[PDB]
Every structure is written in C-alpha cells, then in structure tokens.
Amino acid sequence: LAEFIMLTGTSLFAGDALRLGWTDLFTTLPDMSYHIKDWFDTTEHMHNDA
Amino acid sequence: KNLNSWYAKGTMRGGVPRIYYAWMRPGSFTRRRFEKMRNPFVDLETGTSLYFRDTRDSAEAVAHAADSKGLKGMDNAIDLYNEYRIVPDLYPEGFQWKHKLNTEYNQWRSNTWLTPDLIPQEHRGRFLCNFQLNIVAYDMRVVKFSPKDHRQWIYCVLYVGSGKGIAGWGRAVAPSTQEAKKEAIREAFSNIIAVDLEQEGPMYPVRVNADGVRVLLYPAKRIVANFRVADILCAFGFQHAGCRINLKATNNPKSPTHTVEGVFEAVKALRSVSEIAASRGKVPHSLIYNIYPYLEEIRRRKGMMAMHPPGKDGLLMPDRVVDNRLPDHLKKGYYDDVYWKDFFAGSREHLNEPKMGLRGDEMRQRLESAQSRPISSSTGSGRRTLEDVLKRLGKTTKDLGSIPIVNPRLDIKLPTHIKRNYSLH
Amino acid sequence: YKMPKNMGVAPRFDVWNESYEPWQHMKRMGRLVGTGFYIPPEWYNHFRMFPPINHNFQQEKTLNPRNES
Amino acid sequence: MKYADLELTTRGEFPHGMKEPGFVKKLDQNIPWYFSTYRSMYHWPITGDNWSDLNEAEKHHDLHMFYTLAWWKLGEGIFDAND
Amino acid sequence: GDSTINVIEPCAYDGKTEFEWSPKMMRRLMNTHGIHNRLVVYICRTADNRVIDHIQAVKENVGGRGLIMVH
C-alpha cells in the first residue's frame, strides 16, 4: 500500500491515517476549534506544568 | 520631557508610615508551587505524555531533526523559573508556609490573635498585619424592641486598616459603646479589602458611586485628599493617589459614614494594572524582563547547544530484571572486604533478618531502649529471672559484658539464650 | 400606604448574587494574598490553578432566560 | 591595654529601644491631627557622592554598632553555630 | 467575569461639538504624574482621514478629532 498510494491515485482517510500510526488525535465534535479556544481561555496559568 | 521629578513626590503624613515595595509584591515574591511541582497539574497525570510527544515518530525523535522537542520552546525545560512569570501574576501564592500554624503566625505577627472575637470565622488564622483601628464616629439611634420599650443603640463606623495594603471598614448597630465597636470591627474584618500596591496608586481615574456618594479616585503626585479620606488611603498605603468626593464638601450627602464607604467602594472598584493587561490579553511592559532569559537562551542556542545527540532519546526503556539481592548470610560477608567487617549490622530493610551480625553490646542497647511488657499469670513465676537476679546484684544488665546473655528478661536458660542467638553472630 | 410586609429587608434581586460569584472571591483574594500579609485559604491554593470557567454569567445580568449559562 | 579598674553604678538601660514610655494621664496638647499632619523638609540622603570630610555616616554607624554590641554582650551566647 | 472594556466613553455626548485634540493635550494623557502610561486608549481621527489611537497620534505629533476614550 506504500507504493499503491503513490502510483495509483487513491485517497487515504481518517481511519487508515490512524492505523498507519500517523496521527493520535481524532474528533467527532462540532466547532471543535471553538471548543479548543474557549477551553484555553478558561485556562489561566502559562507554565509548562500547567 | 517629564519635569515631574520622581524625587519629590508623595505628601508627608507626619508619622503615618506607608509601605513601599522594592520591586514586586511580597505575594508574588515566592514561587514554591511552581519550582517544586506542588500543584494539581503535576498531580493529575494527564498531559505528562506531551513532554514526550516527541516519541510519536521513533525514528524522528532519535534523529533529532528539529531541536523543538520542547512543549514551549527549545527544551522541555528551558527557563521554567523566569519565562513563565511573564504572565500577569493575578493569583499569587502569597504566604504558604505550614512551618508553624496559621494560628501561631497570626499570633506572632498580628494584634488580632489577641482579639479573637473580632475576626470573623473566615479570616481567623490568616492575617499577619498589625491593624490600627480608627473609630470614625459613634452615634446613637433609638431601637424600639416594642412600642413601650426603647433602647439606645449606639451606631459605630470604624475602619480597621494597615497601610501595608489591607483595610476594611465596618459600621455596626449595638446597644452599647464597646459592643457596637466590637460588632463594627467584626463587620470590618468581614469587609476587608486589599490593594495591588505595585502601582502605588490608581493608574486611571476610578469614577465609582458608593451608596449615594459619587467618588473619584485619580492619580496625583501625592496623596491629596480629605484628612479622613487621606488617612484611609494611607491606611491602604497609597503613596500617589487622590480621592475627591461629591466634587466639594458642600455637596450633599456628606457624612463620616458616606466618606468611609465611598473611598472604600472606589478602592474596591479599582483594577490592577496587571489585571487590566491580562484582561486585554496583552503582556505588560513591566514583566517583560522575564522573557529575557528565554530570549537569551534563544540567541545562545546557536550551533553546538542546539545540536542534540544522534539517536539518543534519553528515554532508556525497560527491558529486563536485575536482582543484586544476596542471601543475608552472604551480604553479612559481602562488604567485609570493602568496608568494615560486618558492614550490615542493623539495617532492617537491608538485612532481612534485623538482628544478625551485631555484637551483644549493641543488642543490649536495643534492649535498653525496649521496656518491660506486663507479665500475665502464666508468664509470672516464683522463679527469679536474671532480670531480678541482676537487680538484687544491682550491678547492671549491661555489666555482663563477656556473658553472651543479651536479654535477661527472657525466661530461658543460659544456653537457650546462646542458642536462640547462635544463628546470628 | 401599604407596602409589602417584609419589603424593608428584601434583597436587591439583581445584585444579591454578585457578592458571591466565585470570580469575585478570586479577584478579591488574589490581592489580599498578593499583599503578603495573609495566609490564603486552602480553596485559593486550588481554585487558583483551576480558576472557574469564564462564561458562566448569571441570568440576572445576561438578561436572557433561554441562555444555558 | 590602657586599664584602670574603675567602677560604675548606673549603666543605661538596654538600648533595645522598647523601654516603656513614662506614662502620662493627660496630654499637654490634646490635638492628635498634629502628628498626622506634620510635614518637614526633605531628607536628601545623598547629595553628590555623599562625600563628607569627617566620615559622618560610617562613623555614626560604627559608634552605634559599638555600644549595641556592648549591650548585646557581643550577641553570640544566644546562638552562633547551633546549626 | 468582568468586561475587558472597563469603561468606554465618547469624546462627545454630542455631534455638533467636535473636539480636536492638541498634540500636547494627547501627550498629557500618557503622562500620569511622571509615569508613562499608555493604559487608557484614546481614539482620535486625524486630518489624514485615518483613525488612530493617541499613541500613534503623538508618535507622529498630529492630533485629530476626538472620537472615544476607552480602557
């Protein structure tokens, strides 16, 4: 499949991107950018431990 | 170009002393909860993986392609002590030693421990500030407990302040002078207020409105306000401030009550500068001297220092088991070549048998520590154990140096001693 | 002139909460403890690291009832 | 050195500063605002390099330290190396 | 819990009264009793039909119609 995606124009997806061991994270939520933003608003301390 | 000299400022109040901070507030002075990892974050484990997010790609982390292993810069830990202080320290540690109790701290450092009924419950063991009470003005209001019964309820206003930063004001109604005074003092220690004196005054005109008295705290070169209001601002420690009330002392309503209430309301409405900044999300000019260690470590992470080892992750994963744990009869001999003969004399954790190797003298010393446990009837006998035998001799249970008995209170014959202790020595 | 029986001691129904909001005590204890003449309560040592959520405004100020504050 | 076996009956107090004040029943001035209002001229601590021909500052600090060490009995039986 | 715009005022509760700010007026706001203070931000619309704070207005020494004060 390594050679396959190169030569044969084919698209990978969420699941296979996951299983190749590519990305850890994966959401199903709406406006997850906004839910990150407001969480990091309510956050308060800017120390690496925090 | 600023012909306001900084060297001629502040209005002298006689002897009234007001605190001044050399650099930063004594609260934000100390940072143990962050240098020593005493925080909910270090406890709650979640997220400690991110410090080792770099091991997503094993080959990449060993390769050290980008130095940027760090969650926040070049290293996981770069300037953990300065760079994080860049944020407006709104919620500072303060005083956090449990060395001696809250009670004994409050007691050594404050005239409030002497007056317990005065501090309400929340503030009890807290304060370390010597509060001066200034009783603004007593009054008398008739209280009608019934149509036929009326009392004279004296009504006090007073402000308990120390120019060290902390000052509240309480007014009370109570039938007697000293009881209304105490009631108002406890209401004041409930209405206690503090102030970020880092700016030593308001940095913007605070135009507040207390219970009918239009107050304006503004910046002046020096405390320029009423005698009463000025002693209140000096009870807070404001060196450069000025409060004006009602626009003029002919403007009603005026009263000692309204004056104290108004100035304290304004000092409450005041926002710190660090709080203003953080509220605007912006870095205050004042604290940018903290990123300078990180800016310098940027500028000095050129070349060799940014160079990270090839293939060396620092994460030296678990693989096998090691057991240097020797049998005790063996570690009893192990160091005999290397340190003093019979290294392992008396470490319980070390020697799985705790007593072995010791000379009877040191075992006798353990026993001297040990005390006489009661004697149940079966254990109690008309025989005289070497305990009371050596009592009658008076000499010592430590005298029998050559005699291999160690614990005379054992109801066992001399060789039974020496056999229960032959395994060891 | 008949006014409500207990009216005299009624609470100010819009500003009776605000004294109690956790953000007020965060703002008001942050300075009390920054002064360095105070020994912060054990709840401040915690809700300092975990400050309350930002946008939980009370319906008495956000005059909007359909709002899941 | 330079010894003469003199005597002394009244030493001072201990200059701990916190000797009780001679108590008074009434005040000769019943005006308390005068302690709160009293300004003065400025105490410019240094004028230029604070140089003065007599060593007016170091000398006085040394003469205060000298007698305070005297009264404190050199201040070391309290603790010096209990640590 | 509290708004970041602590207060926000118009320079004029009226429109018929335009308040042109002298560059010295706008330099005596950032000078609180000897401490340089860019805290309270004042918006003034210059002659160049630009709308700028008093800080860039007095960094180029031009003054403008007063629009708002805010902080």
PDB file of N, CA, C and O in Angstrom, chain B residues 111-157:
ATOM      1  N   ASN B 111      -1.719  41.911  65.959  1.00  0.00           N
ATOM      2  CA  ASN B 111      -2.531  42.266  67.097  1.00  0.00           C
ATOM      3  C   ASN B 111      -3.944  41.758  66.979  1.00  0.00           C
ATOM      4  O   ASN B 111      -4.819  42.296  67.653  1.00  0.00           O
ATOM      5  N   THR B 112      -4.212  40.784  66.116  1.00  0.00           N
ATOM      6  CA  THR B 112      -5.571  40.269  66.035  1.00  0.00           C
ATOM      7  C   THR B 112      -5.717  38.977  66.821  1.00  0.00           C
ATOM      8  O   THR B 112      -6.794  38.675  67.338  1.00  0.00           O
ATOM      9  N   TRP B 113      -4.644  38.204  66.935  1.00  0.00           N
ATOM     10  CA  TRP B 113      -4.720  36.991  67.730  1.00  0.00           C
ATOM     11  C   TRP B 113      -5.071  37.304  69.164  1.00  0.00           C
ATOM     12  O   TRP B 113      -5.640  36.475  69.873  1.00  0.00           O
ATOM     13  N   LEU B 114      -4.704  38.488  69.620  1.00  0.00           N
ATOM     14  CA  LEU B 114      -5.103  38.922  70.943  1.00  0.00           C
ATOM     15  C   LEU B 114      -6.592  39.187  70.995  1.00  0.00           C
ATOM     16  O   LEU B 114      -7.201  39.130  72.065  1.00  0.00           O
ATOM     17  N   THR B 115      -7.193  39.469  69.869  1.00  0.00           N
ATOM     18  CA  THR B 115      -8.590  39.852  69.911  1.00  0.00           C
ATOM     19  C   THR B 115      -9.424  38.858  69.121  1.00  0.00           C
ATOM     20  O   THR B 115      -9.879  39.168  68.017  1.00  0.00           O
ATOM     21  N   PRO B 116      -9.684  37.676  69.663  1.00  0.00           N
ATOM     22  CA  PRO B 116     -10.256  36.614  68.835  1.00  0.00           C
ATOM     23  C   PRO B 116     -11.690  36.853  68.439  1.00  0.00           C
ATOM     24  O   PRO B 116     -12.070  36.530  67.312  1.00  0.00           O
ATOM     25  N   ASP B 117     -12.515  37.403  69.320  1.00  0.00           N
ATOM     26  CA  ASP B 117     -13.926  37.524  68.980  1.00  0.00           C
ATOM     27  C   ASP B 117     -14.132  38.496  67.840  1.00  0.00           C
ATOM     28  O   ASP B 117     -15.238  38.611  67.305  1.00  0.00           O
ATOM     29  N   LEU B 118     -13.082  39.212  67.459  1.00  0.00           N
ATOM     30  CA  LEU B 118     -13.232  40.280  66.483  1.00  0.00           C
ATOM     31  C   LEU B 118     -13.152  39.745  65.063  1.00  0.00           C
ATOM     32  O   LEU B 118     -14.021  40.026  64.233  1.00  0.00           O
ATOM     33  N   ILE B 119     -12.140  38.953  64.771  1.00  0.00           N
ATOM     34  CA  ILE B 119     -12.024  38.390  63.429  1.00  0.00           C
ATOM     35  C   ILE B 119     -13.142  37.384  63.210  1.00  0.00           C
ATOM     36  O   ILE B 119     -13.241  36.407  63.971  1.00  0.00           O
ATOM     37  N   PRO B 120     -13.965  37.527  62.177  1.00  0.00           N
ATOM     38  CA  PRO B 120     -14.968  36.504  61.913  1.00  0.00           C
ATOM     39  C   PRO B 120     -14.287  35.217  61.485  1.00  0.00           C
ATOM     40  O   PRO B 120     -13.061  35.109  61.447  1.00  0.00           O
ATOM     41  N   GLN B 121     -15.110  34.219  61.185  1.00  0.00           N
ATOM     42  CA  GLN B 121     -14.597  32.865  61.084  1.00  0.00           C
ATOM     43  C   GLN B 121     -13.625  32.724  59.934  1.00  0.00           C
ATOM     44  O   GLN B 121     -12.595  32.062  60.073  1.00  0.00           O
ATOM     45  N   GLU B 122     -13.918  33.336  58.792  1.00  0.00           N
ATOM     46  CA  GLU B 122     -13.105  33.049  57.623  1.00  0.00           C
ATOM     47  C   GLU B 122     -11.677  33.527  57.810  1.00  0.00           C
ATOM     48  O   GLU B 122     -10.728  32.801  57.502  1.00  0.00           O
ATOM     49  N   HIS B 123     -11.492  34.713  58.362  1.00  0.00           N
ATOM     50  CA  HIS B 123     -10.181  35.337  58.395  1.00  0.00           C
ATOM     51  C   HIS B 123      -9.351  34.912  59.598  1.00  0.00           C
ATOM     52  O   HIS B 123      -8.267  35.457  59.811  1.00  0.00           O
ATOM     53  N   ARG B 124      -9.811  33.919  60.357  1.00  0.00           N
ATOM     54  CA  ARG B 124      -9.358  33.786  61.736  1.00  0.00           C
ATOM     55  C   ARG B 124      -7.848  33.628  61.824  1.00  0.00           C
ATOM     56  O   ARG B 124      -7.147  34.538  62.272  1.00  0.00           O
ATOM     57  N   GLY B 125      -7.315  32.507  61.355  1.00  0.00           N
ATOM     58  CA  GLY B 125      -5.893  32.263  61.476  1.00  0.00           C
ATOM     59  C   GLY B 125      -5.036  32.921  60.422  1.00  0.00           C
ATOM     60  O   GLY B 125      -3.864  32.550  60.284  1.00  0.00           O
ATOM     61  N   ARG B 126      -5.553  33.907  59.700  1.00  0.00           N
ATOM     62  CA  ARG B 126      -4.982  34.360  58.446  1.00  0.00           C
ATOM     63  C   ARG B 126      -3.995  35.493  58.595  1.00  0.00           C
ATOM     64  O   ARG B 126      -2.833  35.321  58.253  1.00  0.00           O
ATOM     65  N   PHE B 127      -4.425  36.624  59.134  1.00  0.00           N
ATOM     66  CA  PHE B 127      -3.757  37.911  58.992  1.00  0.00           C
ATOM     67  C   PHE B 127      -2.373  37.893  59.603  1.00  0.00           C
ATOM     68  O   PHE B 127      -2.155  37.260  60.630  1.00  0.00           O
ATOM     69  N   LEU B 128      -1.453  38.617  58.994  1.00  0.00           N
ATOM     70  CA  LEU B 128      -0.166  38.898  59.591  1.00  0.00           C
ATOM     71  C   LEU B 128       0.119  40.391  59.636  1.00  0.00           C
ATOM     72  O   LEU B 128       1.282  40.797  59.562  1.00  0.00           O
ATOM     73  N   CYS B 129      -0.918  41.211  59.749  1.00  0.00           N
ATOM     74  CA  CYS B 129      -0.823  42.653  59.625  1.00  0.00           C
ATOM     75  C   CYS B 129      -1.339  43.291  60.907  1.00  0.00           C
ATOM     76  O   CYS B 129      -2.386  42.894  61.425  1.00  0.00           O
ATOM     77  N   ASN B 130      -0.593  44.257  61.433  1.00  0.00           N
ATOM     78  CA  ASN B 130      -0.997  44.940  62.653  1.00  0.00           C
ATOM     79  C   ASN B 130      -1.998  46.030  62.347  1.00  0.00           C
ATOM     80  O   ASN B 130      -1.628  47.132  61.955  1.00  0.00           O
ATOM     81  N   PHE B 131      -3.261  45.746  62.571  1.00  0.00           N
ATOM     82  CA  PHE B 131      -4.324  46.634  62.144  1.00  0.00           C
ATOM     83  C   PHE B 131      -4.523  47.736  63.160  1.00  0.00           C
ATOM     84  O   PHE B 131      -4.733  47.462  64.338  1.00  0.00           O
ATOM     85  N   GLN B 132      -4.468  48.979  62.706  1.00  0.00           N
ATOM     86  CA  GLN B 132      -4.832  50.116  63.528  1.00  0.00           C
ATOM     87  C   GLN B 132      -6.309  50.378  63.346  1.00  0.00           C
ATOM     88  O   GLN B 132      -6.793  50.456  62.214  1.00  0.00           O
ATOM     89  N   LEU B 133      -7.017  50.491  64.446  1.00  0.00           N
ATOM     90  CA  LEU B 133      -8.434  50.783  64.411  1.00  0.00           C
ATOM     91  C   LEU B 133      -8.591  52.288  64.489  1.00  0.00           C
ATOM     92  O   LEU B 133      -7.996  52.919  65.364  1.00  0.00           O
ATOM     93  N   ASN B 134      -9.365  52.872  63.587  1.00  0.00           N
ATOM     94  CA  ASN B 134      -9.709  54.273  63.709  1.00  0.00           C
ATOM     95  C   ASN B 134     -11.217  54.396  63.719  1.00  0.00           C
ATOM     96  O   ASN B 134     -11.873  54.084  62.726  1.00  0.00           O
ATOM     97  N   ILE B 135     -11.759  54.832  64.842  1.00  0.00           N
ATOM     98  CA  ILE B 135     -13.195  54.879  65.046  1.00  0.00           C
ATOM     99  C   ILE B 135     -13.701  56.193  64.500  1.00  0.00           C
ATOM    100  O   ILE B 135     -13.546  57.240  65.130  1.00  0.00           O
ATOM    101  N   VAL B 136     -14.316  56.135  63.327  1.00  0.00           N
ATOM    102  CA  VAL B 136     -14.670  57.354  62.627  1.00  0.00           C
ATOM    103  C   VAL B 136     -15.642  58.173  63.455  1.00  0.00           C
ATOM    104  O   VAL B 136     -15.347  59.312  63.823  1.00  0.00           O
ATOM    105  N   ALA B 137     -16.797  57.608  63.787  1.00  0.00           N
ATOM    106  CA  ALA B 137     -17.780  58.386  64.524  1.00  0.00           C
ATOM    107  C   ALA B 137     -18.883  57.491  65.047  1.00  0.00           C
ATOM    108  O   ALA B 137     -19.614  56.871  64.277  1.00  0.00           O
ATOM    109  N   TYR B 138     -19.031  57.480  66.366  1.00  0.00           N
ATOM    110  CA  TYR B 138     -20.128  56.810  67.041  1.00  0.00           C
ATOM    111  C   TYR B 138     -21.373  57.653  66.872  1.00  0.00           C
ATOM    112  O   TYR B 138     -21.278  58.843  66.577  1.00  0.00           O
ATOM    113  N   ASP B 139     -22.530  57.050  67.078  1.00  0.00           N
ATOM    114  CA  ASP B 139     -23.784  57.779  67.078  1.00  0.00           C
ATOM    115  C   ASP B 139     -24.701  57.128  68.091  1.00  0.00           C
ATOM    116  O   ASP B 139     -24.276  56.292  68.880  1.00  0.00           O
ATOM    117  N   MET B 140     -25.960  57.524  68.082  1.00  0.00           N
ATOM    118  CA  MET B 140     -26.968  56.873  68.898  1.00  0.00           C
ATOM    119  C   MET B 140     -28.296  56.885  68.168  1.00  0.00           C
ATOM    120  O   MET B 140     -28.814  57.952  67.833  1.00  0.00           O
ATOM    121  N   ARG B 141     -28.854  55.706  67.946  1.00  0.00           N
ATOM    122  CA  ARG B 141     -30.169  55.576  67.348  1.00  0.00           C
ATOM    123  C   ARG B 141     -31.065  54.786  68.283  1.00  0.00           C
ATOM    124  O   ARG B 141     -30.662  53.740  68.796  1.00  0.00           O
ATOM    125  N   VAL B 142     -32.268  55.286  68.508  1.00  0.00           N
ATOM    126  CA  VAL B 142     -33.199  54.625  69.406  1.00  0.00           C
ATOM    127  C   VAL B 142     -33.752  53.396  68.710  1.00  0.00           C
ATOM    128  O   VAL B 142     -34.158  53.458  67.544  1.00  0.00           O
ATOM    129  N   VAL B 143     -33.769  52.273  69.423  1.00  0.00           N
ATOM    130  CA  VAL B 143     -34.242  50.993  68.913  1.00  0.00           C
ATOM    131  C   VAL B 143     -35.513  50.627  69.657  1.00  0.00           C
ATOM    132  O   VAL B 143     -35.539  50.640  70.890  1.00  0.00           O
ATOM    133  N   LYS B 144     -36.561  50.303  68.930  1.00  0.00           N
ATOM    134  CA  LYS B 144     -37.852  50.082  69.552  1.00  0.00           C
ATOM    135  C   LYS B 144     -38.163  48.598  69.570  1.00  0.00           C
ATOM    136  O   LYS B 144     -38.898  48.104  68.721  1.00  0.00           O
ATOM    137  N   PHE B 145     -37.646  47.891  70.574  1.00  0.00           N
ATOM    138  CA  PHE B 145     -37.938  46.467  70.716  1.00  0.00           C
ATOM    139  C   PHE B 145     -39.421  46.207  70.908  1.00  0.00           C
ATOM    140  O   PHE B 145     -39.865  45.060  70.860  1.00  0.00           O
ATOM    141  N   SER B 146     -40.188  47.244  71.171  1.00  0.00           N
ATOM    142  CA  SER B 146     -41.621  47.161  71.364  1.00  0.00           C
ATOM    143  C   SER B 146     -42.149  48.578  71.300  1.00  0.00           C
ATOM    144  O   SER B 146     -41.366  49.531  71.310  1.00  0.00           O
ATOM    145  N   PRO B 147     -43.458  48.757  71.237  1.00  0.00           N
ATOM    146  CA  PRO B 147     -43.974  50.115  71.390  1.00  0.00           C
ATOM    147  C   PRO B 147     -43.603  50.746  72.718  1.00  0.00           C
ATOM    148  O   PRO B 147     -43.325  51.948  72.774  1.00  0.00           O
ATOM    149  N   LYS B 148     -43.575  49.966  73.797  1.00  0.00           N
ATOM    150  CA  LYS B 148     -43.336  50.543  75.115  1.00  0.00           C
ATOM    151  C   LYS B 148     -41.855  50.577  75.452  1.00  0.00           C
ATOM    152  O   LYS B 148     -41.412  51.440  76.217  1.00  0.00           O
ATOM    153  N   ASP B 149     -41.075  49.647  74.910  1.00  0.00           N
ATOM    154  CA  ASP B 149     -39.664  49.509  75.242  1.00  0.00           C
ATOM    155  C   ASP B 149     -38.809  50.082  74.122  1.00  0.00           C
ATOM    156  O   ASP B 149     -38.959  49.689  72.965  1.00  0.00           O
ATOM    157  N   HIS B 150     -37.916  51.010  74.462  1.00  0.00           N
ATOM    158  CA  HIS B 150     -36.963  51.590  73.522  1.00  0.00           C
ATOM    159  C   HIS B 150     -35.569  51.478  74.108  1.00  0.00           C
ATOM    160  O   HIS B 150     -35.383  51.700  75.304  1.00  0.00           O
ATOM    161  N   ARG B 151     -34.586  51.174  73.281  1.00  0.00           N
ATOM    162  CA  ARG B 151     -33.210  51.132  73.745  1.00  0.00           C
ATOM    163  C   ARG B 151     -32.396  52.181  73.010  1.00  0.00           C
ATOM    164  O   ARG B 151     -32.820  52.675  71.965  1.00  0.00           O
ATOM    165  N   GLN B 152     -31.248  52.541  73.572  1.00  0.00           N
ATOM    166  CA  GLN B 152     -30.311  53.408  72.877  1.00  0.00           C
ATOM    167  C   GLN B 152     -29.247  52.570  72.202  1.00  0.00           C
ATOM    168  O   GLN B 152     -28.299  52.121  72.846  1.00  0.00           O
ATOM    169  N   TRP B 153     -29.408  52.361  70.904  1.00  0.00           N
ATOM    170  CA  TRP B 153     -28.479  51.568  70.127  1.00  0.00           C
ATOM    171  C   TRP B 153     -27.450  52.492  69.520  1.00  0.00           C
ATOM    172  O   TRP B 153     -27.738  53.192  68.549  1.00  0.00           O
ATOM    173  N   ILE B 154     -26.262  52.507  70.102  1.00  0.00           N
ATOM    174  CA  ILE B 154     -25.183  53.310  69.552  1.00  0.00           C
ATOM    175  C   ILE B 154     -24.682  52.650  68.276  1.00  0.00           C
ATOM    176  O   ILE B 154     -24.585  51.419  68.180  1.00  0.00           O
ATOM    177  N   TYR B 155     -24.430  53.469  67.273  1.00  0.00           N
ATOM    178  CA  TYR B 155     -24.122  53.019  65.933  1.00  0.00           C
ATOM    179  C   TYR B 155     -22.737  53.517  65.577  1.00  0.00           C
ATOM    180  O   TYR B 155     -22.518  54.720  65.463  1.00  0.00           O
ATOM    181  N   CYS B 156     -21.819  52.599  65.379  1.00  0.00           N
ATOM    182  CA  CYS B 156     -20.441  52.959  65.160  1.00  0.00           C
ATOM    183  C   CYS B 156     -20.123  52.842  63.687  1.00  0.00           C
ATOM    184  O   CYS B 156     -20.785  52.094  62.971  1.00  0.00           O
ATOM    185  N   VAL B 157     -19.156  53.632  63.236  1.00  0.00           N
ATOM    186  CA  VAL B 157     -18.448  53.435  61.981  1.00  0.00           C
ATOM    187  C   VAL B 157     -16.983  53.392  62.332  1.00  0.00           C
ATOM    188  O   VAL B 157     -16.505  54.218  63.111  1.00  0.00           O
TER     189      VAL B 157
END
